[PDB]
Amino acid sequence: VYLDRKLLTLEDKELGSGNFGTVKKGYYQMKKVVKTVAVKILKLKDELLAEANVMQQLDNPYIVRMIGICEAESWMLVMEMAELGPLNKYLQQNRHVKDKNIIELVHQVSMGMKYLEESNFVHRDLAARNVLLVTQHYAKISDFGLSKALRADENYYKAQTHKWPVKWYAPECINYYKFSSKSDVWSFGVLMWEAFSYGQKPYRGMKGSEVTAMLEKGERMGCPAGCPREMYDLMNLCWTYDVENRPGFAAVELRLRNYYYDVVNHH
Numbered sequence: 001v002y003l004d005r006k007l008l009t010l011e012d013k014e015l016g017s018g019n020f021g022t023v024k025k026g027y028y029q030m031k032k033v034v035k036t037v038a039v040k041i042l043k044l045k046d047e048l049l050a051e052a053n054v055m056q057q058l059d060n061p062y063i064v065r066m067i068g069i070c071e072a073e074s075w076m077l078v079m080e081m082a083e084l085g086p087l088n089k090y091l092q093q094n095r096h097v098k099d100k101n102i103i104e105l106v107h108q109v110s111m112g113m114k115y116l117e118e119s120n121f122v123h124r125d126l127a128a129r130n131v132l133l134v135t136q137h138y139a140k141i142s143d144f145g146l147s148k149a150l151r152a153d154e155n156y157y158k159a160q161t162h163k164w165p166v167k168w169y170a171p172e173c174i175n176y177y178k179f180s181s182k183s184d185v186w187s188f189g190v191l192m193w194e195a196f197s198y199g200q201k202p203y204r205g206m207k208g209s210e211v212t213a214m215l216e217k218g219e220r221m222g223c224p225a226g227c228p229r230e231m232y233d234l235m236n237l238c239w240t241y242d243v244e245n246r247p248g249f250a251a252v253e254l255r256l257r258n259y260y261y262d263v264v265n266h267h
């Protein structure tokens, strides 16, 4: 859990910011090899510790691995490096990634979210900026800063006061401050839209209030160019207003698994 700073080599040039601070590339001298790492630097500490506490409990191929934490110049969250970076930035810079490949990546995210749902954890920040690419064909979920372990007696987490990405938030998050695996299903639908739109921001040119007003009328974002009808149908199903009627990640992952192999068969 607690790493030796002397074994941690940090690169001078940062990968970027992120509201919590900065993301840096480094190396952690392991048992026999060297491990390339992405480090979240604080430069709030309670939030970094809670994020690391969540990530330590997670063991899945589609969730970023936390190597550990390190208390030095600043508090550091050390993760296994996914070299290609955020899914949204990647797709914005590689607009010729095939449709089959987008299905493959969004299906990988649903597999990680299926695992997260079974573990009874709520992510609360499921966005394409929080999906990291190991390879063009390998996605992982990172950014567990707003993540919650659900109580043994409740299916939701209730926030006590609203700095919220409203464009990814389900109506019950807004109206009742209630966060569940089904609200992550809503955000996953927004994430699908972003990915099929090659990293375009959702609800372009709209205020958070205008987004809520649109969703309340029953209006939804349109089909991104080239997106198969079946994928846009799944997107819309993730955007079911009623929490109970909205599918869980086991149903969402199965629709994606089947459609992915169907597209793999056609090809």
Ligand SMILES: CNC(=O)c1nc(C)n2ccc(Nc3nccc(-n4cc(N[C@@H]5CCOC[C@@H]5N)cn4)n3)cc12
Pocket (backbone or CB within 6 Å): 015, 016, 017, 018, 023, 038, 040, 064, 079, 080, 081, 082, 083, 084, 085, 086, 129, 130, 131, 132, 142, 143
């Ligand atoms: C700030 N920019 C980058 O993070 C970034 N830029 C480039 C060019 N990268 C390349 C590889 C890489 N790898 C990598 N692997 C494992 C974990 C991470 N984590 C990054 C975050 N937090 C970010 C907050 C800011 O938004 C993006 C993220 N969600 C959480 N985990 N990162 C990251 C980046």
